[PDB]
Amino acid sequence: MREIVHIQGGQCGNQIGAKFWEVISDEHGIDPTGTYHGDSDLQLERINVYYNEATGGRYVPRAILMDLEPGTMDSVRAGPFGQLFRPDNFVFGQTGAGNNWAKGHYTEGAELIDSVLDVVRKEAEGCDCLQGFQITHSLGGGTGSGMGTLLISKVREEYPDRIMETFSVVPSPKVSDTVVEPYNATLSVHQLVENADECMVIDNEALYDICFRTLKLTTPTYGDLNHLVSAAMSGVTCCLRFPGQLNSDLRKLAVNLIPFPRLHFFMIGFAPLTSRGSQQYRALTVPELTQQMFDAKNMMCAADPRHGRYLTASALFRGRMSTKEVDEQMLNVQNKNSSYFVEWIPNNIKSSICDIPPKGLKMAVTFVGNSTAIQEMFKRVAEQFTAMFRRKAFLHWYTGEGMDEMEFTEAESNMNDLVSEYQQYQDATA
Amino acid sequence: MREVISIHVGQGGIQVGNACWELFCLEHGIQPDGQMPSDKTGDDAFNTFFSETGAGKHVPRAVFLDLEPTVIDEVRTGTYRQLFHPEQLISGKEDAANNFARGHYTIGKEIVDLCLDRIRKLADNCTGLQGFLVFNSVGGGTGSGLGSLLLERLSVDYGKKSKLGFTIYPSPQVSTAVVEPYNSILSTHSLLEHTDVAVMLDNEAIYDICRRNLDIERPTYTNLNRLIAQVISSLTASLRFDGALNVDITEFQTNLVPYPRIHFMLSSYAPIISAEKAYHEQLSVAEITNSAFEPANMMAKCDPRHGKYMACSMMYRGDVVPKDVNASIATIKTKRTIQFVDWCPTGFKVGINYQPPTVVPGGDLAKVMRAVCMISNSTAIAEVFSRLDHKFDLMYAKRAFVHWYVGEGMEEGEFSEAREDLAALEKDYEEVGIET
Amino acid sequence: MREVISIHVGQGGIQVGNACWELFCLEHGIQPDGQMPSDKTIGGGDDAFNTFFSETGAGKHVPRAVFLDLEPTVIDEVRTGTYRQLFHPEQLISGKEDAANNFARGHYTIGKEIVDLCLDRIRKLADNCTGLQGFLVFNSVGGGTGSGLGSLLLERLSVDYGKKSKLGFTIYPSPQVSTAVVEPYNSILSTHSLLEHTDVAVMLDNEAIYDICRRNLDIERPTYTNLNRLIAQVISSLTASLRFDGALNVDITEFQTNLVPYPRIHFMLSSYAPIISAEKAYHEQLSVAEITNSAFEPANMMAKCDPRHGKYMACSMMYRGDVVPKDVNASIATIKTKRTIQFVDWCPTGFKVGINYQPPTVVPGGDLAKVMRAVCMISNSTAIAEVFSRLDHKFDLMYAKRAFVHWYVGEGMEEGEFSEAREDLAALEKDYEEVGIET
Amino acid sequence: SKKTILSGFMKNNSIVGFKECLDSQLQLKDSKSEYNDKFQSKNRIHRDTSIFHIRNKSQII
Amino acid sequence: MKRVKESYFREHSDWSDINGCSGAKEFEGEDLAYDARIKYQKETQKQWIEQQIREKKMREEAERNEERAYA
Ligand SMILES: Nc1nc2c(ncn2[C@@H]2O[C@H](COP(=O)(O)OP(=O)(O)OP(=O)(O)O)[C@@H](O)[C@H]2O)c(=O)[nH]1
Ligand SMILES: Nc1nc2c(ncn2[C@@H]2O[C@H](COP(=O)(O)OP(=O)(O)OP(=O)(O)O)[C@@H](O)[C@H]2O)c(=O)[nH]1
Ligand SMILES: Nc1nc2c(ncn2[C@@H]2O[C@H](COP(=O)(O)OP(=O)(O)O)[C@@H](O)[C@H]2O)c(=O)[nH]1
Ligand SMILES: [Mg+2]
Ligand SMILES: [Mg+2]
C-alpha cells in the first residue's frame, strides 16, 4: 500500500541506514531474528510499507546497500540487527573510490551500476503500489557523491512519476576531514539539482552544535549523530505508516512545500530535545514544542534562518493532540515574526497530525522548512571551490579518466546561477 | 583481501627492514618461528603483510636485495632464519662500492632479472594488491642503482600500481662518505619521474630527536630503525585494524600531492618521550598534536617556518575522539606562526584508528594509548635541494671523481640533465609557493 | 580555569622562586614529591590548585613556572633539591657562562642562545592554560644576567602578546647597602628598558626588609631565606583572592584598573601587616584598625622610601582572614580623618579594598606567627622620585670619569646608551614632579 | 589447524550444497494430499452456523 | 575497512538493551563513566611507567657491569 524502497550507498550512507533500520524495527517491534513480538494492532496493518514477507513468518527490509569497497557492508553485517538485510541486496566493488568523484562517477561506478540497477528494478517491480524512493548519502566522499547521483539519474530516467528523496550530508568548512570536498560537492550538487525531487541537507557541524548545546553531553559520536538523523527520517514518514487526525503523504508535503521546481533544498529539525539533567524540569506542551522547533540553534543545518526569509514551512506532530492549540500556536508564531516570513505567500505553514507517538513519548514534532537562508552554504562552498580551482589544484586526478575543465566551469556556473535565482525571491515584493 | 609488498635494498634498507618486521611480527603475535604463539591457544589481519603457507607458518610478502652478501648471511644465521622463504633473500657477489654507475649499469642488471621473477612470484599470489613500499639508503652506490633500476622496471611492468619510497637523504653537514652528492643527485633524477610518493628520512633530525627527547647520548642505527618502523606501523595500521575514519594507500596521492611534479613530503611522529618522564605529563591529544607541528620535531632537517604549507595528513591511533581532533585543528589553524598557501583553504586530511601503539622489548619509547603520525607537503623542502646542488657544483667545477663513473659504462653528460632536473624542480616549487 | 604564568630569572629570582613555590605547595596541600595526599579542600572548590598547578590526569602536578639562569650552580641545586620530583625536568633552563654582572654580556652576547628556549617553553606552558590571567616576573636588577635577560624577555613578550598583563617584582640596590660596585649602571639600563615594557612594577629593595626583620622579628642574624619568605607571603596575599572565596574578590585585571592613573607612572611600593614575632604576639590585640594603622608608617615599609615627603595617588588593600566590611570602612574613615597622610587633590577617592576569607598559613621552620588577620598594601605615591634621583647621582658620580665603560663598549653595546637612559630617567622624575602639583 | 586437514578422499565424497535443505521449508506433511484435504473431511448431518467477524484487518497472503 | 566499535571502549549494545530509543530520550553519548574511566586508566598507566623504570635501571646495571670487568 503506497510503499517505499530504501537505497543506501557509501560508508556514511550505510552507517545511517544501519541506525534507521534499527529505529524502524524497534518502533514496529521486530527482533533482529525477524520475528514479531509486538503488543498492538497498529504495528502490523501498515507493516508492508517498509518490510517484505518471507516464508516462515519473518520480515525482511526492502533496502539495497551499495559501496565500492566491501569493508563497510561486511562491518554493518556485524552490527546489531545486521541479520535482517538480505545478502542478495549487498552490492560491492573490490577497489573503492578514493574520494575521487570522477572515479566513482565515470570509470568504476559505470560498470558497477548494472547489478544494483537490476536489483532495484526487481524490487520496484515486485511491490504492488509504488510511492517513491529515498536515498541517504554524503556529498563529501567520492563514492557516495558520484555513484548516488549517477543512480539517481538512471532511476529518474526510468520512473519519472515517482517521488524521490535525498538526505545529503554537505561537507562543512569548519569540521573538514578531506581536502577534495569542494570539487565533488559541487559536482554532486550540479547533478542533484536536475533530478532530485526533494533534497534535505544535514551538516555535521550543526549536529555537533546541537549535541553540545542542547544535549550538553560530554562525549558525542557518530552514533549519536546517526541517532538524531534516524529520528528525523522516522518523523517525516510516521503518518504514512500510522493513522491520524490529518494524513499527509510525501507527495502532499512536496506539493505544499516547493513553490518552484528548482527550489527543493530543505533544512529540518526535530523536537523535543532535552538534556538528561533538564529532562525532569520542562513540561511537554504545544508552546514548548513550537518554541523549541522554531529555535535557530535547534536546526540541523549550520545556516541561520534569521538571515533570510522563510519561503514556507511544514510541521508534523506526533501524539494525541487537539487541533485548536496547534492552529492557534502556528498563527501566533506567524504573526509575531512577520519580518522573517515573505509576504506574497500568505499562510505559508502546513500542519499535519499523527496520533501514534514515538515509543516512550507523547508529543513529537518534525519540521521541514524551505528558506532562503541556505544560500550561504552554497556561497561558501563556491568560494572555496573557486579559490582552489583558479590555480588548477587537485585537477589531473579528475581529468585523467575522461573529464575536462568545461564540466567544472559549467557546474560552477550552474551552482552560482542557482544561488542568484534562489536569493532573487528573497527581495521579491508585491 | 588487501596486501602490500615490501622491497628492501641497500644496507640501510636491510637494517630497517629487520626492525620493521620485528615490529609487524610482534603486532600480529607471531613467534620468530612463524607460527601462532606456541600451544597456549585468528582475526585475519596478517593477510595485509603475511600469507598463510597452507600448513601452519606465515611467510612475509617482502623481498631483500643486496650485492654484498654480509647482511644476508647474518639475517640467514639469526633467529628469524626459518621465518623468511629461503629464496627471497637475493644476494650478489661484488658490491658497487658507493658507485652509482656500477649498480646501475654494470652488475645490478644480472640480479634485477631474478628480482623481477621473485616479484612476479609474490604478486601473482596477491589478489587485492594495494601497492609497493620501497626502502633504500640513497647515499650508496648499489642501493641507489638497484633502487632506480627496480623503479623504472616496475613502472613498465605494472603501470598504475602505487609505489612509496622512503629514502634517507644525507644530512646537510654530517656524512659518512665523500662521493654521495653525485649518486644522490643521479638517484633523484631517476626517482622524480618514477616515484608516486617520496618521504624524507634524513638522519640528522632523528639524531637530534633522540638526543633531546629519549635522553640517549650514545644512540646507534637501531634506535633510528625502530623510530622509522613505528612510522611505518602508524601509516599502515589503517589497512589491518578497525577505525572510525579509515585511510587507504590510494587515499594519499589524491590528497597530499597537489601537482605530479610535487610528491616529496616530510614526516613527524608524536609523542616521543623517554619513559623516565613519559607519563608525568598527561599526553593529551592537544599537546601531542602541538608537538607534532613543532619545528624541532621534524623527521628531516628542514624548517617549515621558512615556507608555506600545501598539504597535511595526520593519522591518529589510540584513544582519540573526533571532537578533540577538530578542536585541535581549529587551534592549529588559528595559530599565526603556521601559514597555509592561499589556494588551499582546507589542507588537513585526518584518519582515526583504534589499535594502540606497541612497545618492543628492549625498546626505548613508552607504550601509550594515543599517538599521531603527520606527513606534510610544504614549500620549505627546497633548501635541502639547494644545499645539495651547491655541494655538487663545488665537486663538479673541477671534474673530480668523474672518472670513476665514466669508466663504468655511463658517458659524460648525465650530470647535466640531473642538474637541469633539479633546477626545474626548484623552479616548480618556487612558482607554486607564490601567492596569486 | 584561571591561570597565571611565573618567570624567575637570576639567582635572586631562583631563590625567591624556591620560597614562593614551597609556600604554594604547603598552601594547596600538594606534597613535595608532587603526589597529592588527597582531600576535599577548605576553600573555593577543588579547582583552586589549578590557579598555580596543572593536572597531569592523576599524580604529580607541574607548577606553571619557568626558571632561567646562565650559571648552573643554583639550577643544579634546585634539580638536586627536595622538589626534584615536582618541577618538570626540562623547564629549568640553565646555560654555561655567567654574564659576570655586566649588562652588555647578558643583553647582547649570550642572551639570544637562551631566549629562544625560554620562548618555546613559554609556548608549551601557555598552550596548556585557557584563561591566562597574566604573567609575573622576578629578577634582580643589580645583576648582569638577571637584568639583561629580564629586559630581553620583556621586550620580546611585548611583541609576542601585547595586551596581556605583566607584573614585575623588582629589587633595586639599597641607598647605601650594595654588594657589587657597578650595579648603578645596569640598574639604569634596566629601568631605561622596562619603563616601556612593564604594566606594573613593584619595588622590593633589601635594606628596608632588613630593617623590618630586625625591628619586628627580633632576629639579629637573618639570611636571604627570611626575605624570600616575606616576599612569598606578599605574593600569596596578593594572589589569594584568585582562588579563595571572599566577600569582595579582586582579580589581576582590577589592579591596572585602579592603581595606575597614567601609563607612564606604573611604579608602586608595597607594605604588609601584621609583621610580628610569636613571643611578642602574646601582647597586642590584632584588630583591623591597628593593623591598618601599622600598614601606614614608613618604618613598616619594605621599600626604603619616605611617603611623608610626597602625595599619594592610589591605594590597594587586600585583607584576608575574618575581616568585616564595616570595620574596614571604619578604618578607611579614620585614615582619611588623619592629617599626617595627604592625598593628591584630583583623587577624592583613592582606596581599592578587597576581602578574602582564608587566613594566612605558616611554614614550619619559619619566623612569623599564626594570625587570624592580615592586610597587604600596594600604593602609588609621589615619594618614589627620591630613589630615582639617588641612582641618578650615583651614576653621574661613576660616569663622570667614564670608569668601567671599556667593558660595556667591548661586547658590542655602543657608548651612547647611557645618555639616553639618563634622559629617560630624568623625564621620569620630571613627570613625577608635575604629577603631584596642585591645580 | 583451519584448512590443513583437507584431503582428496574426504573432499570429493562430501556433499556441500545439495545435502538436506534448511528448516522452515520442510513444512509440508507428505501423506496429506488432494481429494484428502476436503473429500476425506468427515461430513456431518447438521452444520454449525457460528461465524465470527473479528474487528481486525485480515492478513493478506 | 570495518567499523565494529561505536566508540573505542564500549562495544555495540545487545538487542535487548535497545528497548526504546525510537524517540530520542537516551543517547548513550552521555557516557556517565567519564571520571571513573579516566581515574581507572591513569593508575594502570602509572604502572606502565614504573615497569619501564625497572627495565631502564636493569639495563643500566647491565651496561656498567662489562666495563667494570674490562678495567
Ligand atoms: N638511517 C640509516 N641510514 C643508514 C643506515 N645504514 C647505512 N645508512 C646510510 O647508508 C649510506 C651508505 O650506504 P649503505 O647503506 O651503507 O650501503 P648501500 O646503500 O648498500 O650502498 P654501498 O655502500 O655502495 O654498498 C650511509 O651514508 C648512511 O647514511 C642505517 O642503519 N640507518
Ligand atoms: N633580597 C635578596 N636579594 C638577592 C637574593 N639573591 C640575589 N639577590 C640580589 O642579587 C644581586 C646580585 O645578583 P645575583 O643574584 O647574585 O646574580 P644575578 O642577579 O643572576 O646576576 P649575576 O651576578 O651576573 O649572575 C644582589 O645585589 C642582591 O640584591 C636574595 O636571596 N635575596
Ligand atoms: N553523519 C555521519 N557522517 C559521517 C560518518 N562517517 C563519516 N562521515 C562524514 O563523511 C565525511 C567522509 O565521508 P566518506 O567516508 O568519504 O563517505 P564515502 O566516500 O561515501 O565512504 C567526513 O567528513 C565525515 O564528517 C557517519 O557515520 N555519520
Ligand atoms: Mg653498502
Ligand atoms: Mg649568577
PDB file of C-alpha atoms in Angstrom, chain C residues 131-255:
ATOM      1  CA  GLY C 131      42.032  31.631  30.940  1.00  0.00           C
ATOM      2  CA  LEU C 132      45.552  33.008  31.406  1.00  0.00           C
ATOM      3  CA  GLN C 133      45.235  35.975  33.765  1.00  0.00           C
ATOM      4  CA  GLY C 134      48.750  37.322  33.348  1.00  0.00           C
ATOM      5  CA  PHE C 135      52.481  36.964  33.788  1.00  0.00           C
ATOM      6  CA  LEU C 136      54.567  37.608  36.885  1.00  0.00           C
ATOM      7  CA  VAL C 137      58.330  38.105  36.608  1.00  0.00           C
ATOM      8  CA  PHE C 138      61.013  38.020  39.301  1.00  0.00           C
ATOM      9  CA  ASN C 139      64.569  39.236  38.754  1.00  0.00           C
ATOM     10  CA  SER C 140      67.400  41.116  40.424  1.00  0.00           C
ATOM     11  CA  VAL C 141      68.242  44.423  38.760  1.00  0.00           C
ATOM     12  CA  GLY C 142      71.763  44.689  40.197  1.00  0.00           C
ATOM     13  CA  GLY C 143      72.907  41.516  38.473  1.00  0.00           C
ATOM     14  CA  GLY C 144      74.101  41.317  34.905  1.00  0.00           C
ATOM     15  CA  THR C 145      72.414  38.141  33.692  1.00  0.00           C
ATOM     16  CA  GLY C 146      69.177  38.828  35.551  1.00  0.00           C
ATOM     17  CA  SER C 147      68.916  42.378  34.255  1.00  0.00           C
ATOM     18  CA  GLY C 148      69.836  41.566  30.658  1.00  0.00           C
ATOM     19  CA  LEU C 149      67.593  38.531  30.338  1.00  0.00           C
ATOM     20  CA  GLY C 150      64.718  40.331  32.051  1.00  0.00           C
ATOM     21  CA  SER C 151      64.988  43.241  29.639  1.00  0.00           C
ATOM     22  CA  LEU C 152      65.202  40.945  26.616  1.00  0.00           C
ATOM     23  CA  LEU C 153      62.269  38.787  27.729  1.00  0.00           C
ATOM     24  CA  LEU C 154      60.089  41.813  28.437  1.00  0.00           C
ATOM     25  CA  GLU C 155      60.918  43.319  25.041  1.00  0.00           C
ATOM     26  CA  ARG C 156      60.183  40.044  23.256  1.00  0.00           C
ATOM     27  CA  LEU C 157      56.981  39.299  25.183  1.00  0.00           C
ATOM     28  CA  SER C 158      55.659  42.797  24.495  1.00  0.00           C
ATOM     29  CA  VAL C 159      55.558  41.860  20.797  1.00  0.00           C
ATOM     30  CA  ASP C 160      54.679  38.184  21.302  1.00  0.00           C
ATOM     31  CA  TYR C 161      51.492  39.134  23.153  1.00  0.00           C
ATOM     32  CA  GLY C 162      50.955  42.812  23.882  1.00  0.00           C
ATOM     33  CA  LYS C 163      47.656  43.218  25.700  1.00  0.00           C
ATOM     34  CA  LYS C 164      48.198  40.505  28.338  1.00  0.00           C
ATOM     35  CA  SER C 165      49.083  41.914  31.750  1.00  0.00           C
ATOM     36  CA  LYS C 166      52.651  41.584  33.024  1.00  0.00           C
ATOM     37  CA  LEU C 167      53.758  42.374  36.574  1.00  0.00           C
ATOM     38  CA  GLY C 168      57.354  42.752  37.664  1.00  0.00           C
ATOM     39  CA  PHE C 169      58.670  42.420  41.206  1.00  0.00           C
ATOM     40  CA  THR C 170      61.977  44.223  41.012  1.00  0.00           C
ATOM     41  CA  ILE C 171      64.613  44.586  43.724  1.00  0.00           C
ATOM     42  CA  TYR C 172      66.696  47.753  43.473  1.00  0.00           C
ATOM     43  CA  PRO C 173      70.032  48.285  45.233  1.00  0.00           C
ATOM     44  CA  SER C 174      69.717  49.907  48.627  1.00  0.00           C
ATOM     45  CA  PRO C 175      70.754  53.564  49.049  1.00  0.00           C
ATOM     46  CA  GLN C 176      73.950  52.607  50.882  1.00  0.00           C
ATOM     47  CA  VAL C 177      73.813  48.809  51.090  1.00  0.00           C
ATOM     48  CA  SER C 178      75.037  47.045  47.959  1.00  0.00           C
ATOM     49  CA  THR C 179      77.156  44.038  47.031  1.00  0.00           C
ATOM     50  CA  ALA C 180      78.571  44.821  43.585  1.00  0.00           C
ATOM     51  CA  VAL C 181      80.345  48.021  42.519  1.00  0.00           C
ATOM     52  CA  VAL C 182      78.820  48.553  39.048  1.00  0.00           C
ATOM     53  CA  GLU C 183      75.145  47.878  39.817  1.00  0.00           C
ATOM     54  CA  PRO C 184      74.032  51.509  39.198  1.00  0.00           C
ATOM     55  CA  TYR C 185      74.974  51.143  35.523  1.00  0.00           C
ATOM     56  CA  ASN C 186      72.884  48.068  34.811  1.00  0.00           C
ATOM     57  CA  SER C 187      70.082  49.298  37.079  1.00  0.00           C
ATOM     58  CA  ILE C 188      69.820  52.478  35.000  1.00  0.00           C
ATOM     59  CA  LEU C 189      69.950  50.463  31.781  1.00  0.00           C
ATOM     60  CA  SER C 190      67.286  48.058  33.054  1.00  0.00           C
ATOM     61  CA  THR C 191      64.863  50.811  34.062  1.00  0.00           C
ATOM     62  CA  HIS C 192      65.500  52.554  30.736  1.00  0.00           C
ATOM     63  CA  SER C 193      64.416  49.285  29.133  1.00  0.00           C
ATOM     64  CA  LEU C 194      61.478  48.289  31.345  1.00  0.00           C
ATOM     65  CA  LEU C 195      59.804  51.708  31.504  1.00  0.00           C
ATOM     66  CA  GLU C 196      58.247  50.975  28.098  1.00  0.00           C
ATOM     67  CA  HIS C 197      57.589  47.249  28.591  1.00  0.00           C
ATOM     68  CA  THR C 198      56.089  46.661  32.066  1.00  0.00           C
ATOM     69  CA  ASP C 199      52.469  47.227  33.072  1.00  0.00           C
ATOM     70  CA  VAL C 200      53.051  47.224  36.851  1.00  0.00           C
ATOM     71  CA  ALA C 201      56.356  47.326  38.733  1.00  0.00           C
ATOM     72  CA  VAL C 202      56.745  46.668  42.462  1.00  0.00           C
ATOM     73  CA  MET C 203      59.725  47.995  44.420  1.00  0.00           C
ATOM     74  CA  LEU C 204      61.336  45.476  46.789  1.00  0.00           C
ATOM     75  CA  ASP C 205      64.688  46.876  47.954  1.00  0.00           C
ATOM     76  CA  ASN C 206      66.648  44.891  50.529  1.00  0.00           C
ATOM     77  CA  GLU C 207      67.673  47.375  53.234  1.00  0.00           C
ATOM     78  CA  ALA C 208      64.051  48.022  54.188  1.00  0.00           C
ATOM     79  CA  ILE C 209      63.260  44.326  54.619  1.00  0.00           C
ATOM     80  CA  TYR C 210      66.461  44.019  56.659  1.00  0.00           C
ATOM     81  CA  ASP C 211      65.182  46.789  58.928  1.00  0.00           C
ATOM     82  CA  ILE C 212      61.755  45.131  59.110  1.00  0.00           C
ATOM     83  CA  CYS C 213      63.095  41.725  60.129  1.00  0.00           C
ATOM     84  CA  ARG C 214      65.407  43.390  62.644  1.00  0.00           C
ATOM     85  CA  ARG C 215      62.745  45.527  64.322  1.00  0.00           C
ATOM     86  CA  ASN C 216      59.799  43.114  64.224  1.00  0.00           C
ATOM     87  CA  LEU C 217      61.019  39.508  64.142  1.00  0.00           C
ATOM     88  CA  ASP C 218      63.706  40.149  66.805  1.00  0.00           C
ATOM     89  CA  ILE C 219      66.235  38.288  64.647  1.00  0.00           C
ATOM     90  CA  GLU C 220      69.811  39.530  64.869  1.00  0.00           C
ATOM     91  CA  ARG C 221      71.131  37.145  62.172  1.00  0.00           C
ATOM     92  CA  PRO C 222      68.631  36.826  59.316  1.00  0.00           C
ATOM     93  CA  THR C 223      69.529  35.476  55.889  1.00  0.00           C
ATOM     94  CA  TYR C 224      68.013  35.655  52.396  1.00  0.00           C
ATOM     95  CA  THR C 225      65.669  32.807  53.351  1.00  0.00           C
ATOM     96  CA  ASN C 226      63.659  35.115  55.621  1.00  0.00           C
ATOM     97  CA  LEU C 227      63.478  37.802  52.935  1.00  0.00           C
ATOM     98  CA  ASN C 228      62.283  35.261  50.378  1.00  0.00           C
ATOM     99  CA  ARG C 229      59.679  34.033  52.860  1.00  0.00           C
ATOM    100  CA  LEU C 230      58.357  37.572  53.304  1.00  0.00           C
ATOM    101  CA  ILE C 231      58.234  38.097  49.531  1.00  0.00           C
ATOM    102  CA  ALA C 232      56.414  34.784  49.098  1.00  0.00           C
ATOM    103  CA  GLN C 233      53.894  35.791  51.753  1.00  0.00           C
ATOM    104  CA  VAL C 234      53.308  39.066  49.903  1.00  0.00           C
ATOM    105  CA  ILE C 235      52.736  37.197  46.633  1.00  0.00           C
ATOM    106  CA  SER C 236      50.351  34.749  48.293  1.00  0.00           C
ATOM    107  CA  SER C 237      48.344  37.553  49.880  1.00  0.00           C
ATOM    108  CA  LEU C 238      48.177  39.335  46.522  1.00  0.00           C
ATOM    109  CA  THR C 239      47.005  36.269  44.591  1.00  0.00           C
ATOM    110  CA  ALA C 240      44.821  34.536  47.199  1.00  0.00           C
ATOM    111  CA  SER C 241      41.575  36.149  46.010  1.00  0.00           C
ATOM    112  CA  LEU C 242      42.068  34.496  42.614  1.00  0.00           C
ATOM    113  CA  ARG C 243      41.496  31.040  44.127  1.00  0.00           C
ATOM    114  CA  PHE C 244      39.848  31.517  47.546  1.00  0.00           C
ATOM    115  CA  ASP C 245      36.301  32.722  48.119  1.00  0.00           C
ATOM    116  CA  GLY C 246      35.773  36.132  49.697  1.00  0.00           C
ATOM    117  CA  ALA C 247      33.205  38.863  50.164  1.00  0.00           C
ATOM    118  CA  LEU C 248      34.937  41.230  47.708  1.00  0.00           C
ATOM    119  CA  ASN C 249      37.081  39.367  45.183  1.00  0.00           C
ATOM    120  CA  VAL C 250      39.765  41.280  43.281  1.00  0.00           C
ATOM    121  CA  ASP C 251      41.188  39.906  40.035  1.00  0.00           C
ATOM    122  CA  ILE C 252      44.527  40.732  38.446  1.00  0.00           C
ATOM    123  CA  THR C 253      42.693  42.957  35.973  1.00  0.00           C
ATOM    124  CA  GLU C 254      41.494  45.060  38.923  1.00  0.00           C
ATOM    125  CA  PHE C 255      44.979  46.393  39.646  1.00  0.00           C
TER     126      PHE C 255
END
